[PDB]
């Protein structure tokens, strides 16, 4: 037998970043699996040039993910902060560069709130996902 301390916020965060950006490249059509009924997703200010509202739950998020046409998504992660927050959650701030559809790497930040899934030990879901490119602003 072997007992260790609960995974740290930083371990949960770093493992989350590894799986999230891998899936974005490899199977963006499977990213929706990370989210639950009450999850919010926000990816940039503008979509066809129109202001994009937050969407909620797996289906609307799957749709929003599919609409962004993630193809050949290359990510360079430069820094990850992950801290304990409300309700045994983890707040993550990612700083990195992202290329979609062979466009040039652009600086971004991404804010996530991760929450315990509730039924499986060390399992989390994404409650909040907020992406912004720096150039945007």
């Amino acid at each position: 037998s072997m007992v260790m301390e609960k995974p740290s916020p930083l371990l949960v965060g770093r493992e989350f970043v590894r799986q999230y950006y891998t899936l974005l490249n490899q199977a963006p059509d499977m990213l929706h699996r990370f989210y639950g009924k009450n999850s919010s997703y926000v990816h940039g200010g503008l979509d066809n040039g129109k202001p994009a509202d937050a969407v909620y739950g797996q289906k609307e998020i799957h749709r929003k993910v599919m609409s962004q046409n993630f193809t050949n998504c290359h990510t360079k992660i430069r820094h990850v902060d992950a801290h304990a927050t409300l309700n045994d959650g983890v707040v993550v701030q990612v700083m990195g560069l992202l290329s979609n559809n062979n466009q040039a790497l652009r600086r971004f930040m991404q804010t996530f709130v991760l929450a315990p899934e509730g039924s499986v030990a060390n399992k989390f879901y994404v409650h909040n996902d907020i992406f912004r490119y720096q150039d945007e602003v």
Binding site: E15, Q19, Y20, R33, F34, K37, S119, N122, K123
Partner: peptide, 14 residues
């Protein structure tokens, strides 16, 4: 203890 994993809670409605 199982390793760190990710996914939404069970929803048989959706």
């Amino acid at each position: 203890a199982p390793r760190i994993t990710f996914g939404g809670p069970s929803d048989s409605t959706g």
